[model samples]
Target: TTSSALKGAIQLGITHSVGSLSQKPERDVLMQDFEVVESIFFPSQGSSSTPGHHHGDFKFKTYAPIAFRYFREMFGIRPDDYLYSLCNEPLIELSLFYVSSDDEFIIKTVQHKEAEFLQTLLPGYFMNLNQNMRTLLPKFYGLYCVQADGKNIRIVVMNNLLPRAVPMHLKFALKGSTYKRRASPKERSKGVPTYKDLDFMQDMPEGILLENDHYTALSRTMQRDCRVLQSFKIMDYSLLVGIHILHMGGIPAFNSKGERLLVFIGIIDILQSYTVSVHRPSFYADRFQKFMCSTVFRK
Candidate 1:
């Protein structure tokens, strides 16, 4: 059933009616924005987070033709459309460098270095209003492992680029994002962890209660109330996160507008449920489990 439905959608794209947004002002803006986002996130077609790969030197790809068709058919698009307007003139820049265990990160000090103190300086011209905390994250430059006396070390210099306009809601969210550090002071992780950690089930006490409420309240009074037993609803963007997890069971559950209210809550909940991994999985099954299942356990 799922495969057939998906195939139908794929075929529909061949004859699908293109919306107004697929042309002219909307199309151009969307294409430009897509180009920019793709440059920042994927740079080259098959680039890695390594040297010699930068946004300034990559190509762009699009799922736009098919995606916008579906988007138009399902939600429809308008001139004052939030997605298009918000995306207009949006910007991003990124660079990564591999560092060794023994090297200290070099704090950029160039007069124009976005790595300098945020409040003390304007990182750059670009500014993100949605989650403002100086989008000017430091850019990772050339990195090399060097030996100091007897110790093997690594050193890297960065040039953080400030995030400019990003589309959200129906407005620019220009003043909505507060400019602060990337992570909260309460967070303990220092880097992006492997996707495996996202699926590790630990039987959190509070989670047990929430999941229980979500499941139990499925259609009951609790559902009407502010409670439901693990009634999770996933979204299209979340499919990105699930894809990042690279697990069979980790795939997103997308039924058009199913659990609409719950989808709202799910987005917020997923963002708050953070995880970090300092060590790789010791076993294959554990790794497999991490990739496939959205495991939820009781305390």
Candidate 2:
């Protein structure tokens, strides 16, 4: 059964049984760390929209064993929970966002093109992340693709940026540009709009105040990340900043010493990259300027 197969596949992948390699005398295991699985599914009538052809093709891939091991170890995730929910639980947000029952990780679906591009960049991304420990970049664990009911869905599991332990007061999605950046009326009606550059400037006239040391650390981290993106000709990424407002006696307020703090920050949408570009320098400069002056940081 498709359902049973899917469940077994998730368990197998999480247990590191889908594939394995090792450092041996016959071969040196240098870059042999990824694994893959391919399968097909046949949905019953009324389960899918496609009538004539409903067989589904599924592919699942995971990082090197060492990388997978490290991710699970450092993030404190259980294989059973990770695989169980993904295989059994209902997907949140209409199947776009899949949150584990423990709420520790997020499984987001990506476009096929973006998925392909993402796979190509995973090696370099892993290498850079290993070298730099203070980066404000998204942490990815694995990727999967499924073609069922005449539809294709690709997904990647990543750390939930919005920490479950903290409460966020505000959220901003910044691209460092004012061009078509304002949140739509529908978004604004939601009370807390996913604010943009212009909205941020208006709301935070003085910008987010940061201590000298904190500012320096964040600035340096952003610079390093920008350089990495530039090297790969990647553009159109956004900084997702979530602010946790301090409250005293249930009233909104600042810290005891009157200081605002940045709760969460990460670079997202990095799957978009240009392999060949004639105006790469200009694009880089634009990105650098926007990030340097973005409202998320104030010296």
Candidate 3:
């Protein structure tokens, strides 16, 4: 009864598509790269699960193989390991949020519109990421779809910002908004919570201070990345910030008042832009940018 055929189908899907994509000859990426898709259909005739399993027939699809191959390679993710992470163990699922076994990646299930927007946003994103290799933008490895019993599941694999070994003192999903942004009684009592703008302001009024040069680069990268979203008429993204007070050696970053700290930051929630009504997307995007620059970072 513990044997899962749906999970097995997904694993086979990745094995046939993603793993195979990794082996293709290297070539220059082009506009067509964003438009391509690879899909495979599996028949149920001889595919019954060994030792008796559901073994339903299904289909698999992946988007932008060449572009994703470049992205994953540039990010330095191993293809062999990528296969192992999800296929090796049960994908930790928290309401469609899948945590890979190795803790390096998180696969988030997305809707049709969000997935479409990402593909459309890819060319511009490709331009930005190439020049600004160190941008704090979310690293997208792949977008996939699996059809099981007529239900299509679309998930995008991304780099997880929070490292497993590092314990965070605090974390925030910052939208650069104060109203309706604080952690409520329920959220606070649950456990390790992602606090919002009001909580962050109250807890650390001075905000984060980075080294002069680091701040400049961070500022530029954020601004540049923000414009790409703005250009696409997308808004309601977030800056995921995790704070870790250092005990010893770690990636070098400092706290607001000058204390050793390891900071984890990434621009997230970009895909939600599709659900939001626009003409106002631009408005919110600009507003978020202004609030973050003026209040969130310290010189």
Please name the candidate that would achieve the greatest TM-score relative to the true structure: 3
Question: How would the candidate models be sorted by lDDT, starting from the highest?
Answer: 3, 2, 1
Give lDDT for model 1: 0.22
lDDT agreement of model 3 with the native: 0.77
Cα displacement (Å) at residue 151, model 3? 1.2
**Count of clashing residue pairs in every prediction:** 21, 1, 0
Q: In order, what lDDT does every prediction score?
A: 0.22, 0.60, 0.77
RMSD of each: 21.5, 6.8, 3.1
- Using all chains and alpha carbons, the TM-scores for the candidates as numbered come to 0.23, 0.73, 0.89
Q: Across residues 41-146, which tens digit of lDDT does each residue of candidate 2 receive?
A: 3343322422222333333344344555455544565555555655446434422665665565777778877877776776677667666777767787766665
Alpha-carbon deviation at 91 in model 1, angstroms: 1.7
lDDT of 1 by residue, 1-299 (tens): 22222222211211212222245343222333321211112222334542232123222212223323323333233323422222222222123231112122222222212212221211121122123222212223222122222332222232211111211111000111123412333332423321212222221112211244443332232122111112111111111111111111111222222221111111111111112332221222232222222232121
Candidate 2's TM-score: 0.73
Task: Enumerate residue pairs that collide in model 3.
Answer: none
Where does model 2 exceed 4 Å of error?
A: 1-29, 34-67, 74-90, 147-151, 248-259, 285-294
lDDT of model number 2: 0.60
Error of 1 at 201 (Å): 5.0
